[PDB]
């Protein structure tokens, strides 16, 4: 027990890992480290040189004020201005150079790190033991290959460079502000820190609201998942409003939390602007108060104020960039957990022995095995067997005996706890695993061919052979010979290219017969010593089976072979047959020997013989008409913003002019002016605050509303679709749930909030331009011509960042798809030992991709650096022109700084709208997908349409008639299920539809319920076609009891009343279902929760609840689609008691696999390939000695 349990956990134990940036940045080797260092240095420099613009602005402001006061001569003013303009030019050039190098080197280093991570991941995944790989959920490895490596690459991409730039900018801004003027900087820092620690409550509230909304939509998404999975039951019982009301109850909680989200976002975005203008006014006021003692001047006050705000504003950029770093580290924590895990079997190394002159003899001695997933069941117990060279052995038995467990033990996929497996007397645990797998050839039931030429697919089996590295002509001859010996040359010659044709997604797609023969050729070409045939003809068509079986027999006449045959006629001439029952060998010997013993083999042969004998924005705005009451004020607060920012610029210009003091004699007057305007700069600062407290709020509210509708309607548009919509491969339950999660959420980027923000930004930009032109037309015209440049730069910074974000995902697609292809077929890869070749191909692909990607990036990084450096040049031109204007008297210091602050506000307000650009990158896509979903309408089976003859209960006879019905499943229209089916149920008949499996007897339920319409033919209820009846009332007449009982999450009373068409009909139905006793025995009454929690119920009680649900509506036609073909024998009797009572008094159509139930049917119909072969009662069918007789004999033997 201790050793066994330790082995079973160690085979599957996935140890966790906590990754950091040390692990990610240690992927560099040697001279690559310098690149990383260089990148960071550049980033830091590109962040430290940015707040020097505040220094140069302060110096130019001081020069302008001094010249206006009359302190210095024209020549001095011109020379100083020109020197400051040169300083802007130098700063712009430096910003360009360092931004280029920082971005390029960060991207290159991220490419290198992620490529190393990808290589290590694929190498590690390929060489894990199969037990761990099976444990990994479906699609986990492919998601780690495709969508977890991009996150790692982003975490160390230019995003971390921008985070470092933001931190450096904050540090440098604080340093500049404290070095130039420390007293005012200290006062401003104290006030800002106080106002931030005072806004910590609002941030906490916003994060809480986000978390609560996420949880509420998680509950809503669980309701959506259960409805889609149980869409048949909901369609049959008309539970399309019940599911929608359970969904709407949870997407109305998300709206309630979105109202807190809106309030918190409005408060936070108002606090951020309160800090801005409060600091501005306080800086100017306290600087004037300190000037009466320091003579600091306007320059130092402006430098300190600008540096403080600059530093604070960039804190937001650091947080957004650091989000990517945190997400990347979490993805690394995942990928490094798997990369570091050591496999249970050391197949990567070359440790082990290699048998020379391998004969091909195998020996199992008391082999015992328990799978790691289920450590309590012994799948294989005391397995003993000896296979001499040349002996073809056959493993037979019922499903779950453990036949494929022997092959899994041989191939080292799983570990055997006790016993001993010997290859020519050498223990299997002391042999090289890759060599062991090379000495065998595994031919599975489902053949896997990879996306390559048939020549390459066949050569995939030459790994580790003596012919692995030979001249290509010898390889071509070998492939030709192997394809001839596999009966594959015949159809290969027919194809145009021949051996070079590409079998895979791209190129021709072959039938199982061709794919299986190519797999046989790939197996034979290696000349194996042991052949493992695991049902190589199980899924094959009967006609194809002949050619392939011939190939398999010719292959296996001369090698040690272990045949697991689905058809026992193929293994009659096997040298030895072993019968397995629950992992134990019951008998072994020749065909004639076992038959004379009349044991399990005799029964299996008899059953086989019997079976053989029987056989865009305006659209969403129009949808959300409610936003019309959130767009009447938003065009009035915008007007207020358009009259508040120009006023703010005017006041700022007046305050700067007030500082034109020649000496200490002007300090009193200045102070008075400073005071007065600083009052207005507050009174107009608060008004705008109020606007933000409303405006942002409305934005978020609007968005929330839209999302809610885009959820509700979308769900209401999925429940409307007919079953053919849900049969399509794309419309999986998980896919539809993910679409409901994503698209309604993502369409929030083109809501009324975006329109309001765009309108506000446009109004502010236009108001700034108008104010600048009115104040001084000579200056406003240049401001009008610099604003297009200053806005394009701000937009294209975001656009190029988006391009950098998209490149990572769009570039590693030709290579991630290859890895997902070779990993989705991982047992085939492992058994061929194609692990090294796949590693070499994938590594070469991504190594080429790195070199391509660096040169791809450099071109865009050039433009990004140019845009980043553009701003100081614009400021230099503006200041030079302004100084030339003050020279000629055509402008005033007040007018110049009013224009400057106006264009500053315009560019800061238009940069709020550009941050919406990434969102509209996805929202647009979402919008078009949602429009298709809303427009999707079922062809004929529509529940919402009120067109059709309604049914009258008084005249409702309840008879059914399928007249000349033929039907094909739309997914596979080639294969017919029903052909020319003529069938009649008279009213009140208890009819049973028995038949061989695959006869399409269960499709009659779908046709009567009108899940589908017949391709050609008619279905009539009481002489009236069902296509002319109202679907809702028709389905209310019917009732359905499915094979596996479905109970939607909720109380027992709710599930039982789903089929209600008074609290006493429900009791009566529960009594008729023999379930009321169990209900009264529950801790509570009918309020007990069943779905997904509460008192769990057995299959019998679930089926009885389903029967009561069907019974409440008092149906005239009860459709029992194998209501007991899921129950154990003991439970089946009470469920059958419930079923028999329901049949009395109404038309009942029972499809049953256990023909004991249908023994009391008035008329029994037997199906065969979709047509009614035999009809009549039980005794007459028995006397007929036909297909029903064979079925009852088969059921008697099968047990």
Ligand X SMILES: Nc1ncnc2c1ncn2[C@@H]1O[C@H](COP(=O)(O)OP(=O)(O)NP(=O)(O)O)[C@@H](O)[C@H]1O
Ligand Y SMILES: COCC(CCO[C@H]1CC[C@@]2(C)C(=CC[C@H]3[C@@H]4C[C@@H]5O[C@]6(CC[C@@H](C)CO6)[C@@H](C)[C@@H]5[C@@]4(C)CC[C@@H]32)C1)COC
Strand-pair partners of 569: none
DSSP tag of 16: -
| DSSP letter for each residue of 1025-1090 | EGGGB-HHHHHHHEEEE-SS----SSBHHHHHGGG----SHHHHHHHHTT-HHHHHTSSSSTT-B-
Q: Name the 3-class secondary structure at 967.
A: strand
Q: Select the binding partner of residue 257 from Mg ion, ligand Y, ligand I6H, none (C-beta < 5 to 8 A, by kind).
A: none
Q: How many whole angstroms separate alpha carbon 1139 and alpha carbon 1039?
A: 13
Compare residues 389 and 400 and give the one whose CB is closer to ligand X.
400
Q: How many whole angstroms separate alpha carbon 934 and alpha carbon 536?
A: 46
CB of 906 to ligand I6H, least distance (A): 8
Taken in order 1001, 1005, 1011, 1015, the sign of the CA dihedral is positive
Strand-pair partners of 197: none
The verdict on 1182 binding ligand Y (CB under 6 A) reads no
Give, as ranges, the residues between 324 and 363 that touch ligand X (CB under 6 A).
none
Strand-pair partners of 560: 530
**534 known ligand binder:** yes
Among 8-16, 31-39, 786-794, 928-936, the segment contacting ligand I6H (CB under 6 A)? 786-794
Among 268-276, 588-596, 804-812, 1147-1155, the segment contacting ligand I6H (CB under 6 A)? 268-276
Determine contact, residues 944/720, Cβ cutoff 8 Å: yes
The verdict on 444 binding Mg ion (CB under 5 A) reads no
Compare residues 380 and 756 and give the one whose CB is closer to ligand X.
380
Give, as ranges, the residues between 25 and 54 that touch ligand X (CB under 6 A).
none
| DSSP letter for each residue of 854-866 | HHHHHHHHHHHHH
Distances (CA, A) of 692 to 240, 281, 756: 42, 19, 12
The verdict on 191 binding ligand Y (CB under 6 A) reads no
Q: Select the binding partner of residue 405 from ligand X, Mg ion, ligand I6H, none (C-beta < 5 to 8 A, by kind).
A: ligand X
- Comparing every residue's Cβ against ligand I6H, the nearest one is 794
Query: x/- string (CB under 6 A) for ligand X, residues 368-397?
Result: ---x-xx----x-----------------x
- b/e 59-89 (16+ beta carbons within 10 angstroms → b): bbbbbbbbbbeebeeeeebbebbeebbebbb
Compare residues 269 and 885 and give the one whose CB is closer to ligand I6H.
269
Distances (CA, A) of 1008 to 214, 299, 777, 1149, 1160: 41, 87, 81, 10, 23
Contacts of 373 (CB under 8 A, 6+ apart): 12, 131, 134, 135
**Of 941, 927, 1103, whose CA–CA distance to 231 is shortest?**
941
Which of 18, 201, 316, 668 is in the footprint of ligand Y by CB under 6 A? 316
Query: x/- string (CB under 6 A) for ligand Y, residues 319-358?
Result: x---------------------------------------
Q: How many whole angstroms separate alpha carbon 953 and alpha carbon 415?
A: 65
Q: How many whole angstroms separate alpha carbon 764 and alpha carbon 911?
A: 11
Distances (CA, A) of 719 to 246, 739, 1144: 13, 14, 33
CB of 214 to ligand Y, least distance (A): 7
Give, as ranges, the residues between 205 and 224 that touch ligand Y (CB under 6 A).
206-207, 210
Among 402-410, 790-798, 908-916, 952-960, the segment contacting Mg ion (CB under 5 A)? 402-410
Which of 171, 203, 723, 1082 is in the footprint of ligand Y by CB under 6 A? 203
> In the chain, what is the greatest distance between 2 CA atoms, to the nearest angstrom?
128
**980 known ligand binder:** no
The verdict on 399 binding ligand X (CB under 6 A) reads yes
Compare residues 405 and 833 and give the one whose CB is closer to ligand X.
405
Can you point out the beta strands (E) in 989-1029? 990-995, 1016-1021, 1024-1025
Compare residues 441 and 656 and give the one whose CB is closer to ligand I6H.
656
Among 177-185, 311-319, 974-982, 1043-1051, the segment contacting ligand Y (CB under 6 A)? 311-319
The verdict on 275 binding ligand Y (CB under 6 A) reads yes
Which of 367, 791, 899, 1007 is in the footprint of ligand I6H by CB under 6 A? 791
Compare residues 303 and 312 and give the one whose CB is closer to ligand Y.
312
Q: How many whole angstroms separate alpha carbon 33 and alpha carbon 22?
A: 12
Compare residues 207 and 949 and give the one whose CB is closer to ligand Y.
207
Residue 383: CB atoms within 10 Å:
23
* Radius of gyration of the chain, Cα coordinates, nearest whole angstrom: 39
Residue 841: CB atoms within 10 Å:
15
The H or E element that residue 662 is part of is none
Give, as ranges, the residues between 310 and 329 that touch ligand I6H (CB under 6 A).
313
Compare residues 273 and 290 and give the one whose CB is closer to ligand I6H.
273
Query: x/- string (CB under 6 A) for ligand I6H, residues 877-916?
Result: ----------------------------x-xxxxxx-xx-
CB of 563 to ligand X, least distance (A): 13
Q: How many whole angstroms separate alpha carbon 415 and alpha carbon 369?
A: 7
Q: Select the binding partner of residue 134 from ligand X, ligand I6H, Mg ion, none (C-beta < 5 to 8 A, by kind).
A: ligand X
CB of 400 to ligand X, least distance (A): 4
Compare residues 315 and 928 and give the one whose CB is closer to ligand Y.
315
CB of 316 to ligand Y, least distance (A): 5
Sheet-wide strand order for 1024-1025: 972-985, 960-969, 1016-1021, 1024-1025
CB of 457 to ligand I6H, least distance (A): 52
Residues binding ligand X: number (CB under 6 A): 13
Which of 216, 296, 404, 721 is in the footprint of Mg ion by CB under 5 A? 404
The verdict on 269 binding ligand I6H (CB under 6 A) reads yes
Q: Select the binding partner of residue 915 from ligand Y, ligand X, ligand I6H, none (C-beta < 5 to 8 A, by kind).
A: ligand I6H
CB of 34 to ligand I6H, least distance (A): 32
Residue 200: CB atoms within 10 Å:
9
The H or E element that residue 1187 is part of is helix 1187-1198
Q: Select the binding partner of residue 794 from ligand I6H, ligand Y, Mg ion, none (C-beta < 5 to 8 A, by kind).
A: ligand I6H
**Of 918, 902, 646, whose CA–CA distance to 790 is shortest?**
902
User: To which residue do tokens 């050391």 refer?
Assistant: 346
| DSSP letter for each residue of 145-167 | HHTTHHHHHHHTSHHHHHHHHHH
Query: x/- string (CB under 6 A) for ligand X, residues 125-154?
Result: ---------x--------------------
Among 178-186, 398-406, 429-437, 806-814, the segment contacting Mg ion (CB under 5 A)? 398-406
Q: Select the binding partner of residue 273 from ligand I6H, ligand Y, Mg ion, none (C-beta < 5 to 8 A, by kind).
A: ligand I6H
Q: Select the binding partner of residue 738 from Mg ion, ligand X, ligand Y, none (C-beta < 5 to 8 A, by kind).
A: none
Q: Select the binding partner of residue 401 from Mg ion, ligand X, ligand I6H, none (C-beta < 5 to 8 A, by kind).
A: ligand X
Contacts of 251 (CB under 8 A, 6+ apart): 216, 217, 220, 708, 711, 712
The verdict on 918 binding ligand I6H (CB under 6 A) reads no
The pairs formed by 983-988 with CB atoms below 8 angstroms and a separation of 24 or more are 983/1165, 983/1172, 984/959, 984/960, 985/959, 985/960, 985/961, 985/1147, 985/1149, 986/959, 987/957, 987/958, 987/959, 987/1022, 987/1147, 988/958, 988/1145, 988/1146, 988/1147
**Of 397, 398, 433, whose CA–CA distance to 415 is shortest?**
433
Where is the binding site for Mg(2+), in residues?
404, 534
- Catalog residues that contact Mg ion under the rule CB under 5 A: 404
- Chain residues binding ligand X by CB under 6 A are 134, 371, 373-374, 379, 397, 399-405
Binding site, residues? 404, 534
Residues that bind ligand I6H (CB under 6 A): 269, 272-273, 276, 313, 692, 790-791, 794, 797-798, 905, 907-912, 914-915
Site for ligand Y, rule CB under 6 A: 196, 203, 206-207, 210, 272, 275, 312-313, 315-316, 319
């Amino acid at each position: 027990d201790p050793r066994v349990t330790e082995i079973l956990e160690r085979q599957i134990k996935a140890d966790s890992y906590g990754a950091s940036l040390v692990d990610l940045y240690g992927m560099l080797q040697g001279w690559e480290y310098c690149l990383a260092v260089a990148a960071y240095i550049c980033s830091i420099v590109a962040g430290a040189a940015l707040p020097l613009m505040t220094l140069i602005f302060g110096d130019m402001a001081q020069q302008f004020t001094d010249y206006s006061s009359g302190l210095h001569s024209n020549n001095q003013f011109v020379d100083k201005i020109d020197e400051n303009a040169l300083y802007f030019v130098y700063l712009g050039v430096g910003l360009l150079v360092f931004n280029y190098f920082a971005t390029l080197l960060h991207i290159v280093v991220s490419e290198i790190i992620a490529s190393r991570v990808r290589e290590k991941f694929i190498w590690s995944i390929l060489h894990q033991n199969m037990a761990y790989l099976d444990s990994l959920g479906s699609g986990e490895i492919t998601s780690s290959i495709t969508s977890d490596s991009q996150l790692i690459q982003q975490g160390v991409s230019e995003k971390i460079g921008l985070a470092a730039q933001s931190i450096a900018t904050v540090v440098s801004a604080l340093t500049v502000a404290f070095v130039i003027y420390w007293k005012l900087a200290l006062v401003l820092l104290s006030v800002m820190v106080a106002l931030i620690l005072s806004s910590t409550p609002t941030i906490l509230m916003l994060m809480q609201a986000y978390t609560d909304s996420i949880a509420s939509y998680g509950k809503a998404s669980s309701v959506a998942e259960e409805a889609f999975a149980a869409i048949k039951t909901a369609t049959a019982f008309g539970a399309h409003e019940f599911q929608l009301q359970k969904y709407d109850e949870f997407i109305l909680e998300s709206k309630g939390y979105g109202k807190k989200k809106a309030i918190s976002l409005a408060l936070m975005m108002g606090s951020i602007w309160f800090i801005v203008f409060a600091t501005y006014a306080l800086a100017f006021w306290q600087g004037s108060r300190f000037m009466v003692s320091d003579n600091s001047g306007i320059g130092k006050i402006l430098t300190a104020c600008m540096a403080m705000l600059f530093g604070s504003l960039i804190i937001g950029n650091a947080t957004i960039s650091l989000k990517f770093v945190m997400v990347g580290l979490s993805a690394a924590s995942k990928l490094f957990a798997m990369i570091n895990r050591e496999p249970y079997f050391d197949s990567a190394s070359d440790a082990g022995e290699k048998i020379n002159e391998f004969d091909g003899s195998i020996s199992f001695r008391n082999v015992t095995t328990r799978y790691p997933s289920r450590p309590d069941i012994t799948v294989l117990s005391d397995f003993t067997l000896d296979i001499k060279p040349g002996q073809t052995i056959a493993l037979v038995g019922e499903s779950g005996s453990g036949k494929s467990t022997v092959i899994a033990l041989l191939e080292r996929f799983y570990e055997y706890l006790d016993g001993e497996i010997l290859l020519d007397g050498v223990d299997l645990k002391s042999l090289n695993i890759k060599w062991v797998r090379q000495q065998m050839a595994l031919v599975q039931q489902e053949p896997v061919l990879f996306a390559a030429s048939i020549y390459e697919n066949v050569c995939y089996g030459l790994v580790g052979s003596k012919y692995e590295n030979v001249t290509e002509k010898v390889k071509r001859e070998l492939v030709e010979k192997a394809c001839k010996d596999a009966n594959a040359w015949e159809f290969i010659s027919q194809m145009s290219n021949g051996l070079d044709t590409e079998v895979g997604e791209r190129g021709l797609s072959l039938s199982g017969g061709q794919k299986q023969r190519i797999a046989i050729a790939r197996a034979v070409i290696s000349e194996p010593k042991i052949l493992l045939l695991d049902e190589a003809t199980s899924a094959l068509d009967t006609r194809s089976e002949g050619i392939v079986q011939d190939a398999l027999n010719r292959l296996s006449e001369t090698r040690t072979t272990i045949v697991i045959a689905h058809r026992l006629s193929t293994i009659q001439n096997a040298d030895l047959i072993v019968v397995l029952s629950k992992g134990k060998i019951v008998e072994t010997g020749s065909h004639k020997e076992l038959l004379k013993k009349k044991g399990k083999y005799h029964q299996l042969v008899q059953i086989q013989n019997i079976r053989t004998k029987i056989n865009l924005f305006l659209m969403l705005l129009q949808i959300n008409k409610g936003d019309y009451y959130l767009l009447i004020p938003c065009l009035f607060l915008a007007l207020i913003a358009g009259m508040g920012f120009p006023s703010f610029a005017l006041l700022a210009g007046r305050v700067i002019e007030a500082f034109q003091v020649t000496g200490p004699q002007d300090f009193p007057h200045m102070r008075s002016l400073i005071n007065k305007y600083t009052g207005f700069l507050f009174m107009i600062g608060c008004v705008l605050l109020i606007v933000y407290l409303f405006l942002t709020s409305f934005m978020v509210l609007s968005s929330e509303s839209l999302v809610y509708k885009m959820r509700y309607r979308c769900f209401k548009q999925y429940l409307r679709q007919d079953m053919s919509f849900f049969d399509r491969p794309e419309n999986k339950v998980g896919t539809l749930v993910t679409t409901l999660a994503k698209d309604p959420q993502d369409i929030e980027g083109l809501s009324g909030g975006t329109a309001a923000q765009l309108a506000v930004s446009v109004v502010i930009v236009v108001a700034g331009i108008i104010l600048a032109v009115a104040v001084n037309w000579r200056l406003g015209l240049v401001c009008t011509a610099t604003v297009p440049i200053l806005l394009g730069c701000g937009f294209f910074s975001v656009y190029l960042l988006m391009v950098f974000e998209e490149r990572i995902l769009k570039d590693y697609q030709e290579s991630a798809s290859y890895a997902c292809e070779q990993v989705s077929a991982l047992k085939t890869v492992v058994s061929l030992t194609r692990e090294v070749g796949i590693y070499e191909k994938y590594s070469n692909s991504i190594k080429d991709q790195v070199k391509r990607s660096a040169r791809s990036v450099s071109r865009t990084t050039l433009l990004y650096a140019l845009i980043q450096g553009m701003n100081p040049w614009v400021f230099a031109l503006g200041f030079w022109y302004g100084s030339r204007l003050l020279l000629e008297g055509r402008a005033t210091n007040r007018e110049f700084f009013t224009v400057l602050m106006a264009i500053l506000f315009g560019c800061q307000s238009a940069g709020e709208f550009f941050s919406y650009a990434p969102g509209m990158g996805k929202a647009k896509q979402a919008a078009i997908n949602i429009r298709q979903v809303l427009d999707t309408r079922p062809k004929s089976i529509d529940i919402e349409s009120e067109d059709g003859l309604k049914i009258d209960r008084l005249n409702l006879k309840g008879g059914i008639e399928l007249r000349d019905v033929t039907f094909r499943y739309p997914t596979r229209p080639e294969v017919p299920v029903l052909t020319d089916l003529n069938l009649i149920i008279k009213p009140g008949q208890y009819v049973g539809l028995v038949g061989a499996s695959g006869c399409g007897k269960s499709t009659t339920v779908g046709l009567i319920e009108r899940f589908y319409d017949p391709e050609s033919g008619q279905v009539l209820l009481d002489g009236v076609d069902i296509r002319d009846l109202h679907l809702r009332t028709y389905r209310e007449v019917l009732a359905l009891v499915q094979q596996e009982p479905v109970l939607f999450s909720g109380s027992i009373r709710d599930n039982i009343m789903v089929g209600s068409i008074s609290e006493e009909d429900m009791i009566k139905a529960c009594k008729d279902a023999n379930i009321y006793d169990f209900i009264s025995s529950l801790p509570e009454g009918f309020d007990t929760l069943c779905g997904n929690k509460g008192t769990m119920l057995s299959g019998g009680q679930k089926q009885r609840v389903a029967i009561a649900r069907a019974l409440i509506r008092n149906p005239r036609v009860l459709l029992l689609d194998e209501a007991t073909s899921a129950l154990d024998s003991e439970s089946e009797m009470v469920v059958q008691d419930a079923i028999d009572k329901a049949s009395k008094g109404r038309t009942t159509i029972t499809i049953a696999h256990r023909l004991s139930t249908v023994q009391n049917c008035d008329v029994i119909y037997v199906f065969d390939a979709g047509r009614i072969v035999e009809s009549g009662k039980h005794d007459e069918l028995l006397q007929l000695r036909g297909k029903y007789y064979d079925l009852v004999q088969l059921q008697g033997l099968n047990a």
